[PDB]
Amino acid sequence: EVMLVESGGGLVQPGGSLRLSCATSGFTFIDYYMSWVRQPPGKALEWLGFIRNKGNGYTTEYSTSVKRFTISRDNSAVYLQMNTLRAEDSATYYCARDIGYGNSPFAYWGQGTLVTVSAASITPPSVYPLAPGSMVTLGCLVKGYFPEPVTVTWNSGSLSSGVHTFPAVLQSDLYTLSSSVTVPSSTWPSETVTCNVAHPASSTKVDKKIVPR
Amino acid sequence: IVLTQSPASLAVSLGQRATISCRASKSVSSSVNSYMHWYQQKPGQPPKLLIYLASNLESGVPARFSGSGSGTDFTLNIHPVEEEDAATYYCQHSRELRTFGGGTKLEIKRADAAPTVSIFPPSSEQLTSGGASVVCFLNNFYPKDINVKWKIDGSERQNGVLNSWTDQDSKDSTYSMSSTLTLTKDEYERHNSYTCEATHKTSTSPVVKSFNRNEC
Ligand SMILES: O=C(O)[C@@]1(O)C[C@@H](O)[C@@H](O)[C@@H]([C@H](O)CO)O1
């Protein structure tokens, strides 16, 4: 029914500028305030500002922390213009439907768009199979990429149970993550188990088979 | 305005009561409504609105969620807690400057569980590139507290160790950990015994997984 879709998030250099957009449908856009909220990885949510509805003259209000950012709208998309970007701005950015004429504000949120403020360059991952030297644990090591995110599936999603994909950790401007899968001894090495790694930022898709030593 | 959420963390047994507090520096009550929201947020997802205007359930939100309070003092109660309730919760002033509280991470307690530990030597493809990572997965354990040490021929190594921990699983309430020791190929090939050692509540002595490079 109601839909919000953030776009425009990517890797951006410090001191740089970016404009994020939020695509809306399923409600009368013109009657609603529209807010932007961010969240640095592993940190609290932070309201940034809103643009008001027609009845209140499409004016804007901002938080103390960014009053540097600018909000605007196409009457059905809403924008966030970000200037002089720095480290603290690195976050997932959300749009949310704010107050209209009674409906709860912040009931509807988009999926967010990831903003990464860094001088480090986009780098594809190296993918390494982790094979053992009743139930067997296999894994993949995804090393040396930038920026986030990368996604991992096993056997194209066919292996859904017993998967652990670990949060990425940054070291010297390169990310590392790993993923493990635990399968019955009857599936492997009898048949093949593959980790499927994707890094949309570098346009990388790698499928790595875990072959016995 | 300042919103002070406490506690920042709490653990509650399945089917018991979770009580989370939010105090405002000034009253957020108008002559009609108290402008306090409560959210639930799970890893990789936007926040979910549970409670609007302090005491009202958003449509479809289970009855176990309850909000109370007025003025400056508010409370989110969850009873009986479910396994899926493992999450971070936020209060927020739902008008004016729309200030979020700092958040509360809720753990759902479960029976103790020893980590399933697996060790992996460097892949032949990593070695070809001149690098060597030894990986250790410590999976599906409880409680959360765990310590891992790497040893190369009995000599502890910390430089080049990268650790990552998952959030509490939403379904089985366990935690998992990954520890990756990165070395150069030349150092790897200069040593034999490689050992992942884990200290956890479930054992009085380290849980050990090992391989010897020249037995490979
Ligand atoms: O700034 C406004 O347009 C607005 O109407 C937004 C509301 O959420 C609320 O904050 C209101 C007044 O501040 C009510 O006190 O201002």
Quickly list its features.
heterodimer, A: 213 residues, mainly beta, Immunoglobulin-like, 2 domains, six-stranded mixed sheet, elongated, B: 216 residues, four-stranded antiparallel sheet, 2 helices, 18 strands, 50% strand, binds 3-deoxy-alpha-D-manno-oct-2-ulopyranosonic acid
Query: How helical, in percent, are the residues of chain B?
Result: under 10%
Extended strand count of chain B: 18
Q: Approximately what portion of the residues of chain B adopt beta-strand conformation?
A: over 45%
Structural class of chain A: mainly beta
Summarize the structure.
With 213 residues, chain A is mainly β. Helix content of chain A is 0%, strand content 48%.
Structure description:
The PDB classes it as carbohydrate-binding protein. The entry lists the keywords antibody, IgG, carbohydrate-binding protein. It forms a dimeric assembly. The complex is a heterodimer of chains A (213) and B (216). Chain A is mainly β and 213 residues long. Chain A folds into two domains: 1-119, Immunoglobulins (Immunoglobulin-like, Sandwich); 120-212, Sandwich (Immunoglobulin-like). Chain A has no helices and 18 strands. Chain A has strands spanning 3-7, 11-12, 18-25, 34-39, 46-51, 60-62, 69-74, 77-82, 91-97, 113-117, 126-130, 135-145, 151-154, 163-165, 169-171, 174-184, 194-199, 204-209. In chain A, the strands form four sheets. Chain A has a six-stranded mixed beta sheet, with no helix packed on it. In chain A, strands 11, 12, 14, 15 and 16 form a five-stranded antiparallel beta sheet that branches. Chain A has a four-stranded antiparallel beta sheet with strand order 1-3-8-7, with no helix packed on it. In chain A, a hairpin with a 4-residue loop joins strand 17 and strand 18. The termini of chain A are far apart. With 216 residues, chain B is mainly beta. Chain B folds into two domains: 5-109, Immunoglobulin-like (Sandwich), CATH 2.60.40.10; 110-213, Immunoglobulin-like. Helix content of chain B is 4%, strand content 50%. Chain B contains two helices and 18 strands. In chain B, the strands form four sheets. In chain B, strands 2-10-9-4-5-6 form a six-stranded mixed beta sheet, with no helix packed on it. In chain B, strands 1-3-8-7 form a four-stranded antiparallel beta sheet, with no helix packed on it. Chains A and B meet through strand 5, strand 11, strand 12 and strand 16 of A and strand 4, strand 11, strand 12, strand 15 and strand 16 of B. Bound molecules: 3-deoxy-alpha-D-manno-oct-2-ulopyranosonic acid.
